[PDB]
C-alpha cells in the first residue's frame, strides 16, 4: 500500500541519513584513522559539510584507480554503473507507456525494446572490459604465475618419485623451456598445528598483560559458558604449558613430513624460462590419457589455497556431486523462514508489521555467505579466486529460488487462504519494494560505517597489542566482498527486468540503490579493502551470463502472463525473445570470451621480448625457484 | 499384412539371389577383371559354388585390412558390426517379453534395459576406436600435413604482402620452428579452363577414332536433343578449333594470375621443422583478435578442396545461414512425394500395390546425395573429408523428418480419412518392414554387381582408349560412399530403437540387413573402392552422437505412448531415461573425444624423436616446400 511504502521509505531514508552523519563524525577522530583509511598505510603513503566525501570519491578516474586499487576492484564497481545504463531508459519508457488489445501488444513490444537495449549495453560493456583486461595484463609487473603451470594427476610409478617423473617428462616434451619445479606436499597437519600455536600465544599474551595490570587470580573456564569446568588457575602457566606441548608436536611434525614420501601429492608447480612456453603448456593436451598430466595456469602465490592441494584429483567429482545434493537441501529447508516472512507480511502499528518482514528475511539470509564458502572449500578448487566465484554462483541460485520464486509462491498461498501467476507477480511487488529499501538503501548506508573492524581494531589495541607494528594486524579491512556484492545486485537486475513491463513503480527504487551503492563503494575502494589477490577480472563472463539468464526469465514470465488472453497468439512473437537472446549470448561468447580464458602466444612473445630488453640480466631461475613452496615451510 | 510381407519378402529375396548369381558369373569373365578387382592393380599386385566369395571376404583380420584399405574403411565397416552387437539382444528380449498394468510396467522396464545395453556397447566401441586411432597415427608414414598448419584470415596490410606478413609473423611468434610457407591463390578461373580443355580433347579423340574407323560425315548437334542447332560438320576441325581457342585463353590466364597480386587470398600453408611445433600452432590462440590469424591442421594434399579456398573467411557465416534456410525448403517440399507414397500404400494385385511404395520412396530419394553434396560445397569447408561428413549430417536429418516422422504423420492422415500417435506408430510399422526389404536387402545385393562402373569401363575402352594406361582412368571404382552408407544405416538404428518396445517384428529385418551389408561391403572394401583421402576415423564421434539422439527419440516417444494410461505416472521414471542418456553422452564426450580432436604434444615428440633416429638426414625443407601449391600449377 502507499501508506506502507511511505512509512518504510521514511524509516530507511532516515537511518541512512543518520549513518552518514555518524560516519562523517567518526572519521574525523584520529584514533580510528587506521580503520577508515587503512589503505595508504598499507601502501606507505600515510603515517601517524558531512557529505564532502561524496564528491571526493569521484576523483581518480579509472586509470588511477586501477593502479591504486587493482583491476578487479574497478571492474566490480563498474557493475553498479552498468545497471544504471540498462535500467534508466527502461524505467523511463515503462513509465511513459504504463503510466497516464493495445495493452497486450504494448507489453509484447516493450519486451523487445527492453531486451534489445539490455543486449546492446551488455555487448558494449563486455567488449570494453575485455580491452581493459588486455591492457592491464600487457603492462602487468613480473609475477611468478606468468611462468608457472600447475600440473595435476601426475601418474604413479613404481620406481620414480613424483619429482623424478615430472623433471623427466618436461625435459623431454618441453626441452629447453623447462626451467625447474616444485612438488606439492601434504603439510596440512603441520600448518594446522602452527596456526593453533599462534592462537595460544595470543591468549598467553592477553593474560600476561591482564595480570601485569592487575596482579590477581584467574578463573577462566576455557569458554566460560560451555567450556571444560576447570578454572585455568594460573592461566599464564596454563597457556605456557599448552604452548610448550604444541611446540614439541610441531617440531616433530616438521621432521616427519619433510622425510615422509607419502606426504607427496602427484602434483607440481612447473616453471619455464619464457612465458611463451608457459602459455603453450597451459593450452595443450600433454598425453594420450585426457585425464592425466593436466595443466593449468598456477594461481599466484597468495591465491593458492593450500588446503585443497591435498585432495586427490580423482575424488573431485564425488565431492562436487555431494555438494550438488547438499545445495538442494539447503535451498529446500529455507522455505520455512520464507513462509514465516510472508506470513508476517500481512495505523502506525500495521505499517510496521508491513515493514519488518524485509528485515526478517535479511536476517535469515545473514549466514548464507558463510555456508556457501564452506561448501565451496569442500569441493576442491585450489584458489581463492575460484572459491569466491563459485560461492557467488550458488548464492545467486539461492536468491532466484528462495528470494524471488518462493516468495511469490508463498505469497499467493497465503493470499488465497490455471494461471494464478497472473496476479501473484504484480501483487507481491509491494514486498520487493519494502525489501529493497531495507537490505539495499539502508544496508549500503550502514556499511560505510565499518563498525565491525572498528571495534576489533580498538579491542586489539587495548588487549593484544604490546609493541609496535602489531597494530598492522589490527588494521585489516578485509576484501570488497565479491562473494556477496555480486549475487545481491543480480537479484535486483532480475527483479527490475521481471517487473519492468508489469510494475514500473519498482524501478525507481532499483535506480536509487544502484546510484547509492556506486558512490559508497567507490569511496571505500579508494580508502579501505586491500585486495587479497589480483585476478584480471576473470569473473566478468559470469556476470554477463547471469544477466542474460535474467532476460530469459523475464521473457518467459511475460509469455506466461500474456497467455491468458483468448486467442492471445502471443507465442509466435514472444518465442523470438528467448531465441534471439540466446543467439546473442552465443555470439558474444564466441566473439569476446577468449579474452578472459586463453592467453595468445603473440602476447607472450611481445612480453618476453620487452622484458628482456628492459632487464637484460634477470636471474629468472633464482626468482622462480623458491616460489610456490608452502608458507608453513618458511 | 502377413500376406503383403510374405510376398514382398519373396520378391526381394529372389532379386538378391539372382543378383548374386549374376555377380558370381560376371566376375569370372577376364575382360572385366579390372572392374571387379580394381584394387590390386592400383596397388601393383595384379596385372593382365557361386557364393565362395562370402567366406573369402572373412579373411584379412582388422590389422591386415587397415593397412590394405585404410583406417576409415575399417572403422566404417565396424558400424554394421556395431548394430548387430546392439540389436541382437534387444530383439531377443523384446521378442521374449512381447511374444507369448503389467504391460505398462514391462514397457518402462524394457526401455531401461535397451538404453543401458546400447549405452554400454557404445562406450566400449567408442573407446576401442579411439585406441585404434592412436595406434594407427603413431605408426603412420610421413605425410606433409603432419608439419603443416593452415592459416586463415591473415589481416590486411597497406605495405606488406600476404607472404611478407606471414613470414614475419611466424618468425617472431614461432622462432626456430618456422620453416617455410606457401600462399593461397585464387586460380579457379585457370583450373576451370584447364578442365574444359581436357573435356574437349576427349571429344576430339572420339571423333578422330570414329572417323578413322568410318570415313564419313558428322552431324552432331552439340547435345543432339537441345543443343545449338548446327551440325558440327567437320567435328574434328570443330573440336580442334575449340581446343585451340581455349588453349590461348589458358596461356593468357596463367600469365595473368601468377602476376596479379589480387589473386592472393589472405591465407597460407605454414610449415614447421617439427610436428611438435605444428601441434602447438594448431591448438593455441595466436593473437588478440580471436577471429584473425586462425590456425588449423592442413588437409593432406589430396583432401584439400581448392575451390573453397577462394571464399573470404568472413563470408562463411552467411553462406551457412542461407543453406540452413535452403535445407528447410528442401525438406519441406519433399512432403509431396511422401504423401504420394503413403497414398499408394493402401489377391496378387493388392500385394504389389502394397509392395511398390517402398520403391517409389527409394526412387524419389535417389538424388538427395547430390543435392546435399552441392549445398555442402557452397558452404566453404576446404576439405573433402569435411564436406562428406557435412552432407551425411544433413542427409540424416532429412531421413528423420521426411522418411520417419512425415511418413507416420501422413500415414495417419490417410487412415483417418489427443494422442493419435498411440496408434500411428505401430500401424505404420508394416510400411517400414516393406521399405527395409527394398532399399536394404535387395539394395545391397544389387550393389555388389557394380553395374555402373562396369558399363563405363567398357565404353571407355571401346571409344576413348587409344593407347596403353589410359585404361587407368577407365578403372575408377569411386569411394566407399560414407556420404550415403552412414545416414542410411542411422535410419535403421532409429527405427529399431523406436519399435523395439512396440513391434518386435521389425527387428529381424534390421538384423538381416546389418548382416548382409557387412559381408557385402567387407568383400568390396578389399577388392574395390580405393580411398580418396585418409582420415584417421575423424567421423567417429558423429556416428556416436547420432546413435545417442536415436535413444533419446525412442525414449521420448515411449513417454508419449504410455502417457494415455489413467494415472500412468510414467514420467517420474521415464524422465530418467533422457536424463541419464544425456549424462552418459557427456561423460563419454569428455572422457574419450580428445582422441579424435587434439594431438597430445607427447605424441608429437615421440614421433619426431623416432623419425630422426630412423632417418638422420632428412631434407624436410625440400620435402615440404613444394607441397600444397596447386594442382593446376603443375
PDB file of N, CA and C in Angstrom, chain A residues 134-135 138 169 172-175 177 276 279-281 283-291 293 590-592 594-595 598-603 605-606 609, chain B residues 134-135 138 169 172-175 177 276 279-281 283-291 293 590-592 594-595 598-603 605-606 609:
ATOM      1  N   UNK A 134      43.121  -6.748 -21.443  1.00  0.00           N
ATOM      2  CA  UNK A 134      44.340  -6.926 -22.202  1.00  0.00           C
ATOM      3  C   UNK A 134      45.360  -5.844 -21.903  1.00  0.00           C
ATOM      4  N   UNK A 135      44.919  -4.605 -21.769  1.00  0.00           N
ATOM      5  CA  UNK A 135      45.898  -3.573 -21.490  1.00  0.00           C
ATOM      6  C   UNK A 135      46.483  -3.747 -20.117  1.00  0.00           C
ATOM      7  N   UNK A 138      49.030  -6.601 -20.270  1.00  0.00           N
ATOM      8  CA  UNK A 138      50.226  -6.262 -21.011  1.00  0.00           C
ATOM      9  C   UNK A 138      51.201  -5.420 -20.190  1.00  0.00           C
ATOM     10  N   UNK A 169      59.697 -35.926 -17.630  1.00  0.00           N
ATOM     11  CA  UNK A 169      58.622 -35.689 -18.561  1.00  0.00           C
ATOM     12  C   UNK A 169      58.764 -34.347 -19.240  1.00  0.00           C
ATOM     13  N   UNK A 172      61.751 -33.866 -21.685  1.00  0.00           N
ATOM     14  CA  UNK A 172      61.527 -34.471 -22.972  1.00  0.00           C
ATOM     15  C   UNK A 172      60.491 -33.736 -23.806  1.00  0.00           C
ATOM     16  N   UNK A 173      59.351 -33.369 -23.224  1.00  0.00           N
ATOM     17  CA  UNK A 173      58.285 -32.763 -24.025  1.00  0.00           C
ATOM     18  C   UNK A 173      58.355 -31.247 -24.187  1.00  0.00           C
ATOM     19  N   UNK A 174      59.111 -30.578 -23.327  1.00  0.00           N
ATOM     20  CA  UNK A 174      59.282 -29.137 -23.357  1.00  0.00           C
ATOM     21  C   UNK A 174      60.752 -28.771 -23.194  1.00  0.00           C
ATOM     22  N   UNK A 175      61.630 -29.319 -24.037  1.00  0.00           N
ATOM     23  CA  UNK A 175      63.039 -29.191 -23.939  1.00  0.00           C
ATOM     24  C   UNK A 175      63.373 -27.767 -24.141  1.00  0.00           C
ATOM     25  N   UNK A 177      62.873 -25.261 -22.433  1.00  0.00           N
ATOM     26  CA  UNK A 177      61.949 -24.297 -21.906  1.00  0.00           C
ATOM     27  C   UNK A 177      61.766 -24.635 -20.477  1.00  0.00           C
ATOM     28  N   UNK A 276      56.078 -17.654 -23.052  1.00  0.00           N
ATOM     29  CA  UNK A 276      55.570 -18.321 -24.221  1.00  0.00           C
ATOM     30  C   UNK A 276      55.466 -19.798 -23.897  1.00  0.00           C
ATOM     31  N   UNK A 279      52.572 -20.450 -21.698  1.00  0.00           N
ATOM     32  CA  UNK A 279      51.350 -20.244 -22.452  1.00  0.00           C
ATOM     33  C   UNK A 279      51.002 -21.465 -23.262  1.00  0.00           C
ATOM     34  N   UNK A 280      52.012 -22.148 -23.777  1.00  0.00           N
ATOM     35  CA  UNK A 280      51.755 -23.340 -24.536  1.00  0.00           C
ATOM     36  C   UNK A 280      51.306 -24.462 -23.645  1.00  0.00           C
ATOM     37  N   UNK A 281      51.992 -24.669 -22.548  1.00  0.00           N
ATOM     38  CA  UNK A 281      51.647 -25.791 -21.702  1.00  0.00           C
ATOM     39  C   UNK A 281      50.235 -25.693 -21.160  1.00  0.00           C
ATOM     40  N   UNK A 283      47.704 -24.557 -22.536  1.00  0.00           N
ATOM     41  CA  UNK A 283      46.665 -24.729 -23.533  1.00  0.00           C
ATOM     42  C   UNK A 283      46.734 -26.001 -24.377  1.00  0.00           C
ATOM     43  N   UNK A 284      47.604 -26.965 -24.068  1.00  0.00           N
ATOM     44  CA  UNK A 284      47.629 -28.138 -24.942  1.00  0.00           C
ATOM     45  C   UNK A 284      47.497 -29.424 -24.156  1.00  0.00           C
ATOM     46  N   UNK A 285      46.997 -30.441 -24.829  1.00  0.00           N
ATOM     47  CA  UNK A 285      46.916 -31.757 -24.226  1.00  0.00           C
ATOM     48  C   UNK A 285      48.325 -32.305 -24.157  1.00  0.00           C
ATOM     49  N   UNK A 286      48.702 -32.888 -23.030  1.00  0.00           N
ATOM     50  CA  UNK A 286      50.063 -33.379 -22.926  1.00  0.00           C
ATOM     51  C   UNK A 286      50.224 -34.846 -23.279  1.00  0.00           C
ATOM     52  N   UNK A 287      49.277 -35.692 -22.902  1.00  0.00           N
ATOM     53  CA  UNK A 287      49.454 -37.116 -23.169  1.00  0.00           C
ATOM     54  C   UNK A 287      48.209 -37.764 -23.743  1.00  0.00           C
ATOM     55  N   UNK A 288      48.259 -39.079 -23.945  1.00  0.00           N
ATOM     56  CA  UNK A 288      47.154 -39.805 -24.562  1.00  0.00           C
ATOM     57  C   UNK A 288      45.931 -39.829 -23.707  1.00  0.00           C
ATOM     58  N   UNK A 289      46.152 -39.973 -22.424  1.00  0.00           N
ATOM     59  CA  UNK A 289      45.087 -40.049 -21.477  1.00  0.00           C
ATOM     60  C   UNK A 289      44.672 -38.622 -21.132  1.00  0.00           C
ATOM     61  N   UNK A 290      43.464 -38.187 -21.493  1.00  0.00           N
ATOM     62  CA  UNK A 290      42.967 -36.847 -21.341  1.00  0.00           C
ATOM     63  C   UNK A 290      42.775 -36.451 -19.894  1.00  0.00           C
ATOM     64  N   UNK A 291      42.893 -37.398 -18.949  1.00  0.00           N
ATOM     65  CA  UNK A 291      42.735 -37.021 -17.568  1.00  0.00           C
ATOM     66  C   UNK A 291      43.983 -37.381 -16.767  1.00  0.00           C
ATOM     67  N   UNK A 293      48.363 -35.827 -16.328  1.00  0.00           N
ATOM     68  CA  UNK A 293      49.297 -34.751 -16.686  1.00  0.00           C
ATOM     69  C   UNK A 293      48.522 -33.535 -17.124  1.00  0.00           C
ATOM     70  N   UNK A 590      31.382 -16.451 -28.278  1.00  0.00           N
ATOM     71  CA  UNK A 590      32.394 -16.808 -29.255  1.00  0.00           C
ATOM     72  C   UNK A 590      33.277 -15.640 -29.666  1.00  0.00           C
ATOM     73  N   UNK A 591      32.702 -14.456 -29.743  1.00  0.00           N
ATOM     74  CA  UNK A 591      33.443 -13.311 -30.198  1.00  0.00           C
ATOM     75  C   UNK A 591      34.342 -12.674 -29.159  1.00  0.00           C
ATOM     76  N   UNK A 592      33.913 -12.620 -27.911  1.00  0.00           N
ATOM     77  CA  UNK A 592      34.701 -11.931 -26.919  1.00  0.00           C
ATOM     78  C   UNK A 592      35.286 -12.765 -25.788  1.00  0.00           C
ATOM     79  N   UNK A 594      37.270 -15.393 -25.361  1.00  0.00           N
ATOM     80  CA  UNK A 594      38.661 -15.783 -25.366  1.00  0.00           C
ATOM     81  C   UNK A 594      39.550 -14.809 -24.592  1.00  0.00           C
ATOM     82  N   UNK A 595      39.196 -13.522 -24.574  1.00  0.00           N
ATOM     83  CA  UNK A 595      39.958 -12.507 -23.861  1.00  0.00           C
ATOM     84  C   UNK A 595      40.206 -12.871 -22.400  1.00  0.00           C
ATOM     85  N   UNK A 598      42.019 -17.526 -22.609  1.00  0.00           N
ATOM     86  CA  UNK A 598      43.220 -18.027 -23.255  1.00  0.00           C
ATOM     87  C   UNK A 598      44.187 -16.906 -23.510  1.00  0.00           C
ATOM     88  N   UNK A 599      45.458 -17.164 -23.282  1.00  0.00           N
ATOM     89  CA  UNK A 599      46.474 -16.158 -23.493  1.00  0.00           C
ATOM     90  C   UNK A 599      47.123 -16.353 -24.861  1.00  0.00           C
ATOM     91  N   UNK A 600      46.970 -15.426 -25.826  1.00  0.00           N
ATOM     92  CA  UNK A 600      47.519 -15.527 -27.158  1.00  0.00           C
ATOM     93  C   UNK A 600      49.022 -15.679 -27.111  1.00  0.00           C
ATOM     94  N   UNK A 601      49.579 -16.535 -27.950  1.00  0.00           N
ATOM     95  CA  UNK A 601      51.024 -16.688 -27.927  1.00  0.00           C
ATOM     96  C   UNK A 601      51.722 -15.401 -28.273  1.00  0.00           C
ATOM     97  N   UNK A 602      51.158 -14.622 -29.183  1.00  0.00           N
ATOM     98  CA  UNK A 602      51.780 -13.368 -29.540  1.00  0.00           C
ATOM     99  C   UNK A 602      51.964 -12.481 -28.322  1.00  0.00           C
ATOM    100  N   UNK A 603      51.026 -12.492 -27.372  1.00  0.00           N
ATOM    101  CA  UNK A 603      51.197 -11.601 -26.251  1.00  0.00           C
ATOM    102  C   UNK A 603      52.366 -12.077 -25.449  1.00  0.00           C
ATOM    103  N   UNK A 605      54.960 -13.574 -26.486  1.00  0.00           N
ATOM    104  CA  UNK A 605      56.198 -13.235 -27.132  1.00  0.00           C
ATOM    105  C   UNK A 605      56.522 -11.763 -26.995  1.00  0.00           C
ATOM    106  N   UNK A 606      55.529 -10.897 -27.137  1.00  0.00           N
ATOM    107  CA  UNK A 606      55.837  -9.484 -27.015  1.00  0.00           C
ATOM    108  C   UNK A 606      56.291  -9.155 -25.617  1.00  0.00           C
ATOM    109  N   UNK A 609      59.848 -10.479 -24.980  1.00  0.00           N
ATOM    110  CA  UNK A 609      60.814  -9.710 -25.719  1.00  0.00           C
ATOM    111  C   UNK A 609      61.117  -8.403 -25.011  1.00  0.00           C
TER     112      UNK A 609
ATOM    113  N   UNK B 134      44.793 -44.014 -32.226  1.00  0.00           N
ATOM    114  CA  UNK B 134      46.111 -43.637 -31.758  1.00  0.00           C
ATOM    115  C   UNK B 134      47.190 -44.556 -32.297  1.00  0.00           C
ATOM    116  N   UNK B 135      46.926 -45.849 -32.351  1.00  0.00           N
ATOM    117  CA  UNK B 135      47.962 -46.724 -32.860  1.00  0.00           C
ATOM    118  C   UNK B 135      48.190 -46.486 -34.327  1.00  0.00           C
ATOM    119  N   UNK B 138      50.237 -43.273 -34.702  1.00  0.00           N
ATOM    120  CA  UNK B 138      51.607 -43.413 -34.256  1.00  0.00           C
ATOM    121  C   UNK B 138      52.489 -44.110 -35.289  1.00  0.00           C
ATOM    122  N   UNK B 169      55.412 -12.712 -39.160  1.00  0.00           N
ATOM    123  CA  UNK B 169      54.624 -13.094 -38.016  1.00  0.00           C
ATOM    124  C   UNK B 169      55.119 -14.387 -37.410  1.00  0.00           C
ATOM    125  N   UNK B 172      58.618 -14.361 -35.709  1.00  0.00           N
ATOM    126  CA  UNK B 172      58.600 -13.775 -34.394  1.00  0.00           C
ATOM    127  C   UNK B 172      57.904 -14.645 -33.361  1.00  0.00           C
ATOM    128  N   UNK B 173      56.730 -15.192 -33.678  1.00  0.00           N
ATOM    129  CA  UNK B 173      55.979 -15.941 -32.668  1.00  0.00           C
ATOM    130  C   UNK B 173      56.314 -17.426 -32.553  1.00  0.00           C
ATOM    131  N   UNK B 174      56.951 -17.985 -33.571  1.00  0.00           N
ATOM    132  CA  UNK B 174      57.343 -19.382 -33.607  1.00  0.00           C
ATOM    133  C   UNK B 174      58.778 -19.522 -34.104  1.00  0.00           C
ATOM    134  N   UNK B 175      59.728 -18.830 -33.470  1.00  0.00           N
ATOM    135  CA  UNK B 175      61.081 -18.743 -33.886  1.00  0.00           C
ATOM    136  C   UNK B 175      61.666 -20.095 -33.789  1.00  0.00           C
ATOM    137  N   UNK B 177      61.185 -22.678 -35.385  1.00  0.00           N
ATOM    138  CA  UNK B 177      60.325 -23.782 -35.706  1.00  0.00           C
ATOM    139  C   UNK B 177      59.775 -23.501 -37.051  1.00  0.00           C
ATOM    140  N   UNK B 276      55.953 -31.224 -33.385  1.00  0.00           N
ATOM    141  CA  UNK B 276      55.623 -30.623 -32.120  1.00  0.00           C
ATOM    142  C   UNK B 276      55.225 -29.185 -32.386  1.00  0.00           C
ATOM    143  N   UNK B 279      51.845 -29.022 -33.865  1.00  0.00           N
ATOM    144  CA  UNK B 279      50.870 -29.400 -32.859  1.00  0.00           C
ATOM    145  C   UNK B 279      50.531 -28.233 -31.970  1.00  0.00           C
ATOM    146  N   UNK B 280      51.514 -27.395 -31.683  1.00  0.00           N
ATOM    147  CA  UNK B 280      51.255 -26.243 -30.866  1.00  0.00           C
ATOM    148  C   UNK B 280      50.451 -25.220 -31.612  1.00  0.00           C
ATOM    149  N   UNK B 281      50.832 -24.929 -32.831  1.00  0.00           N
ATOM    150  CA  UNK B 281      50.137 -23.887 -33.558  1.00  0.00           C
ATOM    151  C   UNK B 281      48.672 -24.210 -33.770  1.00  0.00           C
ATOM    152  N   UNK B 283      46.721 -25.696 -31.879  1.00  0.00           N
ATOM    153  CA  UNK B 283      45.920 -25.668 -30.671  1.00  0.00           C
ATOM    154  C   UNK B 283      45.980 -24.386 -29.843  1.00  0.00           C
ATOM    155  N   UNK B 284      46.601 -23.305 -30.322  1.00  0.00           N
ATOM    156  CA  UNK B 284      46.642 -22.127 -29.456  1.00  0.00           C
ATOM    157  C   UNK B 284      46.141 -20.891 -30.169  1.00  0.00           C
ATOM    158  N   UNK B 285      45.655 -19.951 -29.384  1.00  0.00           N
ATOM    159  CA  UNK B 285      45.239 -18.674 -29.929  1.00  0.00           C
ATOM    160  C   UNK B 285      46.495 -17.918 -30.304  1.00  0.00           C
ATOM    161  N   UNK B 286      46.515 -17.304 -31.477  1.00  0.00           N
ATOM    162  CA  UNK B 286      47.727 -16.610 -31.876  1.00  0.00           C
ATOM    163  C   UNK B 286      47.735 -15.132 -31.543  1.00  0.00           C
ATOM    164  N   UNK B 287      46.610 -14.448 -31.682  1.00  0.00           N
ATOM    165  CA  UNK B 287      46.623 -13.008 -31.436  1.00  0.00           C
ATOM    166  C   UNK B 287      45.454 -12.549 -30.586  1.00  0.00           C
ATOM    167  N   UNK B 288      45.347 -11.239 -30.377  1.00  0.00           N
ATOM    168  CA  UNK B 288      44.310 -10.679 -29.515  1.00  0.00           C
ATOM    169  C   UNK B 288      42.938 -10.858 -30.071  1.00  0.00           C
ATOM    170  N   UNK B 289      42.840 -10.704 -31.369  1.00  0.00           N
ATOM    171  CA  UNK B 289      41.589 -10.810 -32.050  1.00  0.00           C
ATOM    172  C   UNK B 289      41.331 -12.289 -32.317  1.00  0.00           C
ATOM    173  N   UNK B 290      40.317 -12.898 -31.701  1.00  0.00           N
ATOM    174  CA  UNK B 290      40.011 -14.300 -31.761  1.00  0.00           C
ATOM    175  C   UNK B 290      39.559 -14.747 -33.134  1.00  0.00           C
ATOM    176  N   UNK B 291      39.316 -13.810 -34.064  1.00  0.00           N
ATOM    177  CA  UNK B 291      38.909 -14.231 -35.381  1.00  0.00           C
ATOM    178  C   UNK B 291      39.875 -13.697 -36.437  1.00  0.00           C
ATOM    179  N   UNK B 293      44.228 -14.569 -37.878  1.00  0.00           N
ATOM    180  CA  UNK B 293      45.372 -15.483 -37.758  1.00  0.00           C
ATOM    181  C   UNK B 293      44.913 -16.796 -37.178  1.00  0.00           C
ATOM    182  N   UNK B 590      33.552 -36.106 -22.752  1.00  0.00           N
ATOM    183  CA  UNK B 590      34.691 -35.580 -22.022  1.00  0.00           C
ATOM    184  C   UNK B 590      35.812 -36.593 -21.841  1.00  0.00           C
ATOM    185  N   UNK B 591      35.457 -37.849 -21.658  1.00  0.00           N
ATOM    186  CA  UNK B 591      36.448 -38.859 -21.402  1.00  0.00           C
ATOM    187  C   UNK B 591      37.177 -39.369 -22.626  1.00  0.00           C
ATOM    188  N   UNK B 592      36.491 -39.510 -23.748  1.00  0.00           N
ATOM    189  CA  UNK B 592      37.131 -40.086 -24.903  1.00  0.00           C
ATOM    190  C   UNK B 592      37.311 -39.194 -26.123  1.00  0.00           C
ATOM    191  N   UNK B 594      38.722 -36.301 -26.938  1.00  0.00           N
ATOM    192  CA  UNK B 594      40.002 -35.702 -27.241  1.00  0.00           C
ATOM    193  C   UNK B 594      40.832 -36.541 -28.212  1.00  0.00           C
ATOM    194  N   UNK B 595      40.684 -37.866 -28.172  1.00  0.00           N
ATOM    195  CA  UNK B 595      41.412 -38.766 -29.055  1.00  0.00           C
ATOM    196  C   UNK B 595      41.267 -38.394 -30.528  1.00  0.00           C
ATOM    197  N   UNK B 598      42.344 -33.514 -30.652  1.00  0.00           N
ATOM    198  CA  UNK B 598      43.569 -32.822 -30.285  1.00  0.00           C
ATOM    199  C   UNK B 598      44.729 -33.778 -30.273  1.00  0.00           C
ATOM    200  N   UNK B 599      45.861 -33.331 -30.777  1.00  0.00           N
ATOM    201  CA  UNK B 599      47.040 -34.167 -30.819  1.00  0.00           C
ATOM    202  C   UNK B 599      47.942 -33.849 -29.629  1.00  0.00           C
ATOM    203  N   UNK B 600      48.155 -34.773 -28.671  1.00  0.00           N
ATOM    204  CA  UNK B 600      48.967 -34.565 -27.494  1.00  0.00           C
ATOM    205  C   UNK B 600      50.379 -34.186 -27.876  1.00  0.00           C
ATOM    206  N   UNK B 601      50.973 -33.240 -27.169  1.00  0.00           N
ATOM    207  CA  UNK B 601      52.334 -32.868 -27.515  1.00  0.00           C
ATOM    208  C   UNK B 601      53.282 -34.026 -27.358  1.00  0.00           C
ATOM    209  N   UNK B 602      53.064 -34.866 -26.358  1.00  0.00           N
ATOM    210  CA  UNK B 602      53.934 -36.002 -26.172  1.00  0.00           C
ATOM    211  C   UNK B 602      53.974 -36.874 -27.416  1.00  0.00           C
ATOM    212  N   UNK B 603      52.856 -37.023 -28.128  1.00  0.00           N
ATOM    213  CA  UNK B 603      52.904 -37.897 -29.275  1.00  0.00           C
ATOM    214  C   UNK B 603      53.775 -37.261 -30.312  1.00  0.00           C
ATOM    215  N   UNK B 605      56.275 -35.366 -29.859  1.00  0.00           N
ATOM    216  CA  UNK B 605      57.664 -35.500 -29.515  1.00  0.00           C
ATOM    217  C   UNK B 605      58.171 -36.907 -29.747  1.00  0.00           C
ATOM    218  N   UNK B 606      57.380 -37.912 -29.401  1.00  0.00           N
ATOM    219  CA  UNK B 606      57.864 -39.264 -29.614  1.00  0.00           C
ATOM    220  C   UNK B 606      58.038 -39.544 -31.084  1.00  0.00           C
ATOM    221  N   UNK B 609      61.114 -37.701 -32.482  1.00  0.00           N
ATOM    222  CA  UNK B 609      62.327 -38.301 -31.994  1.00  0.00           C
ATOM    223  C   UNK B 609      62.659 -39.557 -32.774  1.00  0.00           C
TER     224      UNK B 609
END
